[PDB]
Amino acid sequence: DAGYVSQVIGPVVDVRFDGELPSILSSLEVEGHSVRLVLEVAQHMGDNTVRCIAMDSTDGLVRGQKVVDTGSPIKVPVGRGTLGRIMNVIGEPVDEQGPIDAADIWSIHREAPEFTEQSTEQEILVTGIKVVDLLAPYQRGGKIGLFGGAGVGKTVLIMELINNVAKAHGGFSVFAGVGERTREGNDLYREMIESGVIKLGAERGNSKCTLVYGQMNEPPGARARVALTGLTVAEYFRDIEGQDVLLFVDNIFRFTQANSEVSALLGRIPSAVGYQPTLATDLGGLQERITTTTKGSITSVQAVYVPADDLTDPAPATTFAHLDATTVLSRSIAELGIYPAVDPLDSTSRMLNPNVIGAEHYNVARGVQKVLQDYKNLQDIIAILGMDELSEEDKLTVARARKIQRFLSQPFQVAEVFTGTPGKYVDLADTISGF
């Protein structure tokens, strides 16, 4: 019945089953490993051998070590029993509050719902950020992406979104930390104990947030499936409990990156820039599950790391088509000191139809993008000559657009710990009138 390890190359294990191989995506438990080592079957190699990716490290694996099939994929605890807990990729508690209550034990592998259960209802999500709510308003129920290179402020912007949207929200939230720093996962945890979002001990059911962490130290098997584990916790609230869930995924680039770290060892010849041939299909199969169906709603916020500020890289460029509102954060805006460093002429929302947000919001958004594109067209001269050759026709459109660039800047509640200025939450009616 059982299988034995035949080959260990890094984070990729070949297991040999003398009769009755496991299915692909099935979870295998290695018997005799010190830590609980879980392998997930990636492919059938051909001679009664499966090839697996390990959810933990493989140092200490012996060829011949017994491997037990579980007959199912990776199964995680779902339900109210996980709120206020920190879960692993394999559903294990790493918060040291004891074992996790299980409303159900769901597989992390699923099909996307269908075309027939799609909710075609565009309604605004008032964020509280001036540059977001004006030029790229977010959809209540849709997929939001915060694109940016390293150190432009996607983690801060997703921290401002957590306490401006998920704080006053009727349903629950899941934060799937997918392959970022472990320090800022401990920062996010202690921020939510003191803000009361996660309540410890006997008030645990009154928590409104589930954390799933798959951070940078973990092997590429763990970082590739921890977004699927964090999605399963949100797919239980959407399907079985039928409610509006929030899913904050920090660095969905790390999902595609962790697949790329194993895929050459999975026997795949490389694609373009270093990525696997299955780049759009791995990324596509995950993101089609984060949808608002007719049962519930999942409003997702996904930070996307953009490698070396290059939006033409295929891992940020493939995930543009999976989103309703893209918040491209720019290094150029941050060198001016303007925060949040949202590029106004690169952020796009599907909500900017005047059929949806109305023509009074639509014209102050299109007018701000018009006056800021004109200023970009005039910096070819007024950064060479010095604002004297314009005859006060479009001298005035510079000083209108220069006030607009600073007015898009906004202090954050979470940037009080960085900068000495209080946080500002702006209403949508106020930011239309001010702009």
């Binding site: 260990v8 694996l61 011949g64 770290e261």
Partner: protein
């Protein structure tokens, strides 16, 4: 014809002759009396070459287990294939032959950690190379340790003073963070890191035992001439009694340069795990990935971008995430990493630079054009970030850095208009000289770190406009005039109060008036 099915042999292995020899030579009637080589805990070398031995047998060897060849040279069982083991070699493969015996040691790779490593120069595996004998007061810990999780950590609050004025002010560093020093060649990357180590000696004599920082310098892929210059420097200063030197130089095997950051971190993790504070400097983490690429291309793992392996991110994230500030349940210790990545013509879009930029919190970006404008340390203030930020800055320095970070932001945009001194404006010209007082304030000679209280007084002397009278070319002498002519009790109460108190910013207001500044 049915015989053409068996025309070409379909081989499911490569070392088939080594299996059929294990069954045909005991069929000889003289040779059943234990004339057999063993396979369970021993191995035979099949192939040697380029520091990769492929070993037949070793059926019970673990992944990443240290093995020993019968020649004495050790190795690490890295590929566990279905019919052999790919063993990288921790020395020269000239002494390994085909048919040599490979003994497994039962041990995943270990190094001596402990307080007996302080003061010593070891190689990438823990053997000391300074010629002072074996390591005495140590124990052998593992090299690949899992990084401490979310619950094991706490926030980075206490600072780690470097002594470099451009980083204690602009890019402040806390105990427990990871600050990348990225730059081109010969731009001040080692010098910034060496000044951080030398400064800890100047601060370990003034703090209690629980506040001391124990440095670890990991030198990967450098010369032995450079490392012996550092040990000569760290002994002349006195920093060797707090410093470990892990040195896998360029003549060492590529598995030794691959493991020396991890072996150096495991030594530095002793101080983190026992409540003390560590500071590890991985000099040329770019040269570790070159050694890891070589070791992986010879193991026939398929290459990716710039022929690097797929797991060269996980090479560096599992190293760098071990620099953590632990919680109070776990002793409260910290480890601060300073990885050094060398770029080529300032191209930080390269593969290893983009990996470590996204791993680390901050980055100290040094430029080769600022280096030759006399700005030394050549810190690019626009591109340099610290993601802990002013949460772990010295207060008082934090009070004056906001005036310094803002004025240098305006001084940079007023530049690319500064080529027209005929075109006076007296508002841009106000900040074109004020930021230039600040720019030549942040210059600093190397191997002389400054105490943090002497730095924040020198930034106070230029943000409040005391040095507005002096010319731009004589501020480095004026900063000596500020320091050497004030009362040295202004520094004694600024270090103890920890911030510029209201009973001090009017004391030292008039104290910078009774000094003579070289400009009139």
């Amino acid at each position: 014809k049915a015989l053409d099915e068996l025309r070409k042999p379909k081989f499911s292995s490569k070392y088939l002759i080594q299996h059929v020899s294990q069954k045909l030579i005991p069929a000889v009637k003289e040779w059943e009396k234990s004339y057999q080589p063993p396979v369970i805990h021993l191995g035979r070398v099949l192939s040697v070459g380029d520091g990769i031995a492929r070993v037949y047998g070793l059926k019970s060897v673990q992944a990443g287990e240290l093995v020993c060849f019968d020649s004495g040279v050790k190795g690490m069982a890295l590929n566990l294939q279905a019919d052999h083991v790919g063993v990288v070699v921790f020395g020269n493969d000239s002494v390994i032959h085909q048919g040599d015996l490979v003994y497994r040691t039962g041990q995943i790779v270990n190094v001596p950690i402990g307080p007996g490593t302080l003061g010593r120069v070891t190689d990438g595996l823990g053997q000391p190379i300074d010629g002072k004998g074996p390591l005495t007061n140590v124990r052998s810990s593992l090299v690949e340790v899992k990084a401490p999780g979310i619950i094991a950590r706490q926030s980075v609050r206490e600072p780690l003073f470097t002594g470099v004025k451009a980083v204690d002010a602009l890019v402040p560093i806390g105990r427990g963070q990871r600050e990348l020093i990225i730059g081109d060649r010969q731009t001040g990357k080692t010098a910034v890191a060496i000044d951080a180590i030398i400064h800890q000696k100047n601060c370990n004599e003034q703090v209690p035992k629980a506040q001391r920082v124990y440095c670890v310098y990991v030198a990967v892929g450098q010369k032995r001439s450079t490392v012996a210059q550092l040990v000569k420097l760290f002994t002349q200063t006195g920093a060797m009694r707090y410093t470990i030197m892990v040195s896998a130089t360029a003549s060492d095997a590529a598995p030794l340069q691959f493991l020396a950051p991890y072996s150096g971190c495991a030594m530095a993790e002793y101080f983190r795990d026992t409540g003390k504070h560590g500071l590890i400097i991985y000099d040329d983490l770019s040269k570790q990935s070159v050694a890891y690429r070589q070791m992986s291309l010879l193991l026939r793992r398929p290459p990716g971008r710039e022929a690097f392996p797929g797991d060269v991110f996980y090479l560096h994230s599992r190293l760098l995430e071990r620099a953590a500030k632990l919680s109070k349940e776990l002793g409260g210790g910290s480890l601060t990493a300073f990885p050094v990545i060398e770029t080529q013509a300032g191209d930080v879009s390269a593969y290893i630079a983009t990996n470590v930029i996204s791993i680390t919190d901050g980055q100290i970006f040094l430029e080769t054009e600022l280096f030759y404008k006399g700005i030394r340390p050549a810190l690019n203030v626009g591109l340099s970030v610290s993601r802990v930020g002013s949460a772990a800055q010295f207060p008082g320095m934090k009070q004056v850095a906001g005036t310094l970070k803002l004025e240098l932001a305006q001084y940079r945009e007023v530049a690319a208009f500064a080529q027209f001194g005929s075109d006076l404006d007296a508002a841009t010209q106000y900040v074109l000289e004020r930021g230039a007082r600040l720019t030549e304030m942040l210059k600093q000679k190397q191997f002389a770190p400054i105490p943090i209280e002497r730095q924040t007084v020198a930034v106070y002397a230029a943000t409040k406009g005391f040095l507005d009278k002096v010319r731009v070319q004589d501020i480095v002498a004026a900063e000596e005039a500020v320091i050497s002519q004030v009362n040295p009790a202004v520094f004694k109460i600024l270090k103890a109060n920890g911030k510029i108190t209201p009973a001090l910013d009017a004391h030292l207001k008039a104290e910078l008036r009774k000094v003579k500044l070289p400009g009139a």
